[PDB]
Structures are given as structure tokens and as C-alpha cells.
Design a protein around this nucleic acid. Structure first.
Ligand SMILES: Nc1nc2c(ncn2[C@@H]2O[C@H](COP(=O)(O)OP(=O)(O)CP(=O)(O)O)[C@@H](O)[C@H]2O)c(=O)[nH]1
Length: 121
RNA sequence: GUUCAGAACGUCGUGAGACAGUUCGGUCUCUAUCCGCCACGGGCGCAGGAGGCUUGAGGGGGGCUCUUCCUAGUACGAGA
């Protein structure tokens, strides 16, 4: 994106089990994409469709934004945040201490849990 | 089916013959009367003569099951 040196960042939205770790970065980001009747449907992000059995997303790869800032940094920051629940963390940890910071909304129902403490460690 | 003659082995029986030992083909009788019943009645009553309507103790009857897909995939459940 021509965005030479400077800018960019590292943020991730990690949380406990079943928390819609694929809600925030779903769409309608103004960036314009995923449509034509073939929208990324519920739980986009490639995946494999096979997970349709229960939308049990394995990992979160790719999915980067571009423009959306009221005339600012434009777009400089990752967007990878594998979901799950202590089922791939360790193995997928490779992405844990990869991008600084990690977003994630607490479940209004179950709420915070273990995955929260361990996820912070 | 075995529980009658056949014959059959097998086998006991000195044999005649037999065996809850099996096997193989071995005649099944049916014009209703009372009660009983499904109706269908014929009489008479039910008490000014009729005709049409009906309400109904009383009996019946059938008196069903499940999947799917609901809300919401939420309470809880660490997920499942
Ligand atoms: N009623 C309701 N449903 C929500 C809410 N947020 C997310 N969801 C629903 O719950 C589903 C799961 O949320 P989401 O975290 O994005 O998916 P996931 O839990 O990460 C499944 P995986 O971990 O495999 O990616 C979503 O399909 C979405 O429809 C909410 O605030 N209210």
C-alpha cells in the first residue's frame, strides 16, 4: 500500500471459548469487499467451509484492512487472531507472542474465564 | 403334531413284537330351538284423537403417536 517505513502495528482479539472471535473483523469495515450475493456469510475468513458443521474455526490467517481512517494512517496493522479454546493455543501459540496487543470482547453471558488469565500470561 | 393300520432304519427284545427314538405320505361331522347377540320387527300401552317436531337421565364412540423445524442454540455446562 505504498505505506513505507513507519506506521503499522500489531493487535489481536483473543478471548475465551465461544466469544465471537470472528465478529469484529467480519465485514462492513467500509473497506468495501465480500459481496455479490456470495458474501463471506457468517464466520468468513476462508476457513474451509467444512467447519460449517459448527463454525468451529481452526485458526485466523490473512484478512488485512486498507483504508478506513478519517485521513490518517490509512491502514497499518495486522489482523490475525486464531480462535478456539485451549485447543490450539499452545500449538498455535506461534501467533501468540507474534503481534503486540490483543483485542477481545468479554461474553455478556459466561463472561471472563480461564482462557482470559492464561491468554494474558 | 404325535397318540391308529404302511413301511423304514435304529435298537432292545432268544422272537412274537415292541421304544417319551426319530422319521415318511394318515378320512376332521355339522340344515338352529331357548337364553346370547346384530338388526329388523309385529302387538299394546304411554290413558280430549290425532300429525310433526324435537330435550335426553341412559349406552356407545373415539378416545393416537412421533419426527421435523421454532425461540435459541440461549441457563447451566471450561468445550463437547
Ligand atoms: N445473540 C448473539 N449472538 C452473537 C453475538 N456475538 C456473536 N454471536 C453469535 O455467536 C456465533 C459465534 O461467535 P464468534 O465468536 O464470532 O464465533 P466463534 O465463537 O469464534 C466460533 P470459532 O471459535 O470456531 O471461531 C456467531 O456465529 C454469532 O452469530 C451476540 O452478541 N449476540
Amino acid at each position: 500500500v505504498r505505506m513505507d517505513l513507519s506506521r503499522i502495528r500489531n493487535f489481536s482479539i483473543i478471548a475465551h471459548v465461544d466469544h465471537g472471535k470472528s465478529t469484529l473483523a467480519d465485514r462492513i469495515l467500509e473497506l468495501t469487499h465480500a459481496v455479490s450475493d456470495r458474501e463471506m456469510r457468517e464466520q468468513f475468513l476462508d476457513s474451509l467451509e467444512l467447519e460449517r458443521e459448527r463454525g468451529i474455526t481452526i485458526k485466523a490467517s490473512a484478512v488485512r484492512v486498507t483504508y478506513r481512517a478519517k485521513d490518517g494512517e490509512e491502514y497499518v496493522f495486522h489482523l490475525i487472531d486464531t480462535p478456539g479454546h485451549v485447543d490450539f493455543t499452545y500449538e498455535v501459540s506461534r501467533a501468540l507472542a507474534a503481534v503486540e496487543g490483543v483485542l477481545l470482547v468479554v461474553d455478556a453471558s459466561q463472561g471472563v474465564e480461564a482462557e482470559t488469565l492464561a491468554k494474558f500470561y
